[model samples]
Target chain A: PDLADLFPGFGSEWINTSSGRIFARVGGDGPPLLLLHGFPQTHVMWHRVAPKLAERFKVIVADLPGYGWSDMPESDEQHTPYTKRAMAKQLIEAMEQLGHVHFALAGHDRGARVSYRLALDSPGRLSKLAVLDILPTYEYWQRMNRAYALKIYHWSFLAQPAPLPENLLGGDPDFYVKAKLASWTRAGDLSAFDPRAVEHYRIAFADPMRRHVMCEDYRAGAYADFEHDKIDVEAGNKIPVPMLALWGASGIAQSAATPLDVWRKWASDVQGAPIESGHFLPEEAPDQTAEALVRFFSAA
Target chain B: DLADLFPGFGSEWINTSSGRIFARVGGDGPPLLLLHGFPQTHVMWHRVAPKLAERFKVIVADLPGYGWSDMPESDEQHTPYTKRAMAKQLIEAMEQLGHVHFALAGHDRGARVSYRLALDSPGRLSKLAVLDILPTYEYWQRMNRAYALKIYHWSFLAQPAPLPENLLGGDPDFYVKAKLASWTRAGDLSAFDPRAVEHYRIAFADPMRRHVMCEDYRAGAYADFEHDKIDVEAGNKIPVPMLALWGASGIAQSAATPLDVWRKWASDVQGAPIESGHFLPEEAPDQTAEALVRFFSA
Candidate 1:
């Protein structure tokens, strides 16, 4: 179903593929741009910024598999099916069908995870890539401690074997999402999220399946993707492209004395600064997030 | 409540300077003090204590920050949760009960208390059994990412108060049950008896107790470790026969040798894997009860 009172003029398509069906919103009429939504959210997360960006470039926003209304694929015992590699494949396959050979990409949170995996695997496929508020998964597992555990405890909580994280989170899925938006935002409130966007996020979590998939996605991070990253780190593989990273200065990354310095360890070419916001950078600072991406990606 | 799970065990509390220590007692002979661990009350011994009680007066007492114990006010260094403070309270309670000298066995957090008790007041301890843990100082030195993954909460709970306290207070029941399920080998609630499980859940349901528990671990990773460092540097060896029992299939054995590791800190130590998983008393009650009976009774 296409968004009626939402997305405004942006048409969405349920692209069916070998892996499963993908739900995405496509608009504008310039160079291709693919926007990926992070955990516990759908493409509508870019409601404020995507339209503005669409004025300059054709913008396409998508829901990660097993999230939003997208199909929930069965994850293996090792949680491979939910790995960013697989999710990236689904997104790439869908965009390929749309005849968009190359594009600029922006992703947030888990979406940033998927975008980075794609940039690494399909380097030539994406011209410019922007990631919001994420460190390498390998570094995460290595640096995980009381602070990380307390802040991103959901990484472990959701990554726990089936039904455990799901059961605990399922008790009140909406509260989980709402509390997250409140906790990770700068104002320490949900005031940043437009009521419509909050409603949309709330709608996606109205069921437990989406929440279950969210856990699987993180489980992949803690287990499968982490192993992949270890291999990459051993081989000294880095993000072999111009990468633009943005983080919430007022949020968790604030604890990092030099957030950009940490990212510089993994990428060959990188530039970014703390956006005066929280973990949900896109929602909390739409214009700032867009300006950062526009300047970095739309540059000469 | 004791009869519901403990049968002949009698429930009571011993008032200390800071708070009252909750306990369940049964059987009679040598006094064997059984202490419980974090996110858990003394009922953690429900499976082993009843059986072990047959040969000794099993004193299964809840530690200060957990179970039926009173919530002490949070202190800056989390002093109320310190092993020194906890050990003193248990020692006084034991002495007040007229058992001047007693055999002691502790699991998880309780083991830390037992170790400190032996070190701080040597005259009061006849024997010490530390289940599923290493000495604090050694634990910090050998810790790596692998071991950290297994026990992230050692740091999580130790984070300065109000932060951990509020987060834990968010979902006390789910948090407690999840910890119980995660630690056991089964990775589910099946290993726990429903009666005992409810008692644990009841204790965790209280948000005030949850905050106190965080304070307990706050001390564990910091204040307790500092005390441990000072004592170890001072060459303070536990002047008692000690048993270092770990779960052969659990994190304790997975990280390092319990007996070999304990030998460094104590004057006399001997133990072997319990051929089970974490939460040994519940997961492998027969072996847990049998081992304690053999060691403490002998």
Candidate 2:
């Protein structure tokens, strides 16, 4: 099922970066704002809020490489291409190609990690940075206890060596994807997701190449991304930009430090509150998610 | 798939407070109970038990939720799957079979149970030997990137029910075979007997057993860790003479010096590396039997 109807009048583009091809939906008319979608999802996740936010900003909804209609680039032993640094760089190049050298950025889940990486690596590139429903990669791993590990066991499971998780999850891609999304929601079902959007997720998730890359994404998180965060943290380097942190009131982030409290450690200026939803903030509470994004980015 | 792998062995299903346990008994002399590990049944001892049976009455029992044993339902606390819970049931099995106290040797998850039994039910074991595992608390506390990658399933199988079960159930054959193959030094199923492999396939192929296997790990992660921690904090060491026999290239040595780690938890500990991988009994049974005979005989 095509997701075009989900983002009406949205101009789709296949932007090429040195790393790979990125599929994006560009819409709206104001300041350039890039929206990066998270794991097991695509640009279609922003369908509910992109149009609303587009009215206020030039909303650029793009699939993070290795997800959605984007190219699943092969990664190396170091998993360099899947690193948040690499992903942040590719997304920046995509934004520049779209004729926006500087833009506001918002990302959820894995994308949120990339968003913060971009903010940390290229301080001047993002006018305002908003991370939805996540802590820094290092903070997440450091705080893993029994309860937290139970909630986000995928952090360890997906990072396992090749073919194990790939073959196991390959057993039932649709069920695994659906069950994961459902479990993360407040309602404990896919009630918040459009069937069409879910179809797109199923398609991407079912691909063998995509599943392998997805694991690499977590591998990058566990090693490279974690190292990146650790270096910045030890150096006492903070995100040198105005930052907004929005999390689901009943989401994965709440399982750890207060979203704002943890964000404060990463940035000099941080502001956010809990949205009345689950992990899929934009879909579950799009109105609140969009309003928060608009207000955070719209402010001076 | 014949269950008669242990020739001239008697099969018995004994009931305990935990559930009904299946064990194979053979030979005669000092009572010796051999417990097998995860992803395998008592059949794991088929190669080694018969040899040990010549001198000592050898009893190889399936750990609860493994093989043909009853998989009792677990609770919010995962009580049924705890090593302590399993140890209690195993003690009862030994008693019902007329051995109130016995020499114990276990590999993998079974080794974990042996150590727990030594700690919680001290007088029940005459001597204890753990094959290819460290204390549960030590494993969890020392998890790093490399170790976590090496022992990924400690976290994977322990994930709250249904997820691991679903994934394991998705491709049980591959999951079981891959697990068996990878843990061996040979890195293949050549070390495993075809009949023994079939036995594992039958047990792992069942969805309930799969869930039970996960609960076993869940117990390892939570209840077992806490249990081990309580003992460590209180300085409660294993009272029995302990033997630690790890496969030379197994998960235990990679984590730490097996004997050095064991010494901290036991009053009397001695061990050496069997020239094998994780499945020391299967891959190098004669060496494993010799080690056990020497320790138990002494």
Candidate 3:
């Protein structure tokens, strides 16, 4: 009801599947496309990119179970499949229920991993796929040398036996969020975001359920996702869909001097570029990034 | 003559053809110069400098037209009000006092002027320390709508009109006190000693002093700041160790950068945040002194 009002022009619906109730926001008029978000953020990550695309395409944005306004699953057993494959399946089921058989998919960070899985598993149901600010699961695991491991220490920290990390983090939500948000970017860019956007991030993180979901998201990455990728590789499977990739040039995800070369092994037909912005590329450099996504999807 | 009044404190008036420059000296090892920041004079470092003096010969001067220094007639055309020109005069004043070279550390506006001195006379400073400032030029270039709104005074004072000078001159102490109070952490004004506040008021008592302060910020916006930054970038390091110390709660958002920005600008830079407000030396005297002592000794 009010979901459409909150995210104007987007069609809103809730799916009651065997997995759980899924909240979905859909908009625009052309071929259907899905957008997924990463850790500590929700579908709001596509706030900037969606409006522009809504003019030409049917855009689907959803709060992955337990993130944003979505419902949290019953227990860890039900949530164990919160891995990329499980999340991708949920989206596919939700879309099928909405009477859409085929669509383009785009995701950022954790969501990018899901996009890869969706393309690999149900290639006939997905048209073009786009992954933002990440490499394939296997590629990332292989590239975790000393420096990369040290840079991404949070992955291991969250991967630990739960309740400990989540309990420590949930003590003062504002401080936890501030520490994370402050460390994510350079000082100049943080100032550029202003106090309002910074406060919004803090508020989103205040919910303990949100924090638990975040830990589980990373937890799944360490266990299930890695195993899934290894099995996929052993079985000689890769994403056969036309793919588009994007990343911020200044951040840790995108290579500083050259484009990331690992995507070649994962996507058979892929094309992408790095936008001159921070980690939040769509929000920070909306116009340029949105234009690039539009052109890539159109060409595919 | 007044050496007996304060332990190890020696007062000297160095006379050159330019003018008589007042210098205060104390301590007993290699010489170190301490420069003060905006809305303050050498006295801001009184507590820390004396402690530093125990190990090194500390020379603290009342910057020309500030503190106890002689106030020269204000001439917009001829006054050495800009940081570059003030830096030149300070170097000459030090040279005339028979000190050839020494290490220097400064805070806030003093840090801005110190950077200029290091650029103009690269051979004169053995080491340099800038407290809580990006290169003024770099700061202005990256000024966004939000930052501009936060540090609005920088542009407010830079305007060339009677507005800033006139408004600031009316009850000057009130304006200065308000500016200082606003920048400080809440409920921590008591950390700023009464003596320090009095010293600041005395310096800003003169109308010409307000003009000089405005001119310094104005010159920073124009060519002087960029000129120094370019010089420093072009293979000019003070040839000795450099240290940067910023307050964790300072307006520079030092916590936001994590000392990465300072490391990028200096060849050899070491720094950390003292858990205090903008006035680090006053707000967290012990931590500030410890950092200074370690920096100087190293």
Worst 10 residues of 1 chain A by lDDT: A1-10
Please give each candidate's TM-score. Answer: 0.85, 0.93, 0.48
Candidate 2 residue lDDT tens string, B1-298: 4657899999899998888999999989999999999899999999999989998899999999899899889987789789999998899999998998899999998999999999999899999999999999988877765566677788888877787887887789999999999999999999999999999988889999888889999999899999999999999999899899998899899889989999899989999998899999999999999999999995
Model 1 agreement with the true structure over B44-147: per-residue lDDT tens digits: 89899987788999999999867877767868888888988999989888887998899999998899999999999989999999898887766655545555
Off by over 4 Å in 2: A1-4
Sort order, TM-score high to low: 2, 1, 3
TM-score for candidate 2:
0.93
Candidate 3 docks at the CAPRI level of incorrect
lDDT of 1 by residue, A161-238 (tens): 676666656656677677777778989778998878887888787677787778789889888788877877898888
Worst 10 residues of 1 chain B by lDDT: B140-149
True contacts preserved, each candidate?
0.06, 0.43, 0.00
Per-candidate DockQ versus the true complex?
A: 0.24, 0.51, 0.01
Candidate 1 regions with alpha-carbon error over 4 angstroms? A1-9, A251-259, B1-8, B27-30, B38-40, B46-57, B71-85, B99-101, B116-124, B135-241, B263-268
Residue B154 displacement in candidate 2 (angstroms): 1.9
Ranking by DockQ: 2, 1, 3
Write out the backbone clash pairs for model 3: A11-A26
Q: Which candidate would rank higher by DockQ, 1 or 2?
A: 2
Decide which is better by TM-score, 1 or 3: 1
Off by over 4 Å in 3: A1-6, A75-79, A186-200, A256-260, B1-298
